[PDB]
# Entry
Amino acid sequence: MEVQSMLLNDVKWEKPVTISLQNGAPRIFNGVYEAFDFLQHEWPARGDRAHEQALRLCRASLMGDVAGEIARTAFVAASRQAHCLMEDKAEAPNTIASGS
# Structure
């Protein structure tokens, strides 16, 4: 069966996961494997155990024991320690008063 995940990406994410890079740009990951690798390459403010928890859960995601939003929420908690939190956006921010 052709899985919705990848072979190069053992565990694919939900997709809409955006990391706001201070010296870069909002980087949207498609797979947890990318994020796990990213965590080792150029993660701005590492931190402590919370940083390790991020890698830890990504490792567990490779086994298929962690779901997308589950790891996602915890990844935000790790990003919280790094203070690299994604600034929340609003979809369709330009509306009109005359509607219904």
Notes: The helical segments are 32-41, 49-63, 68-82.
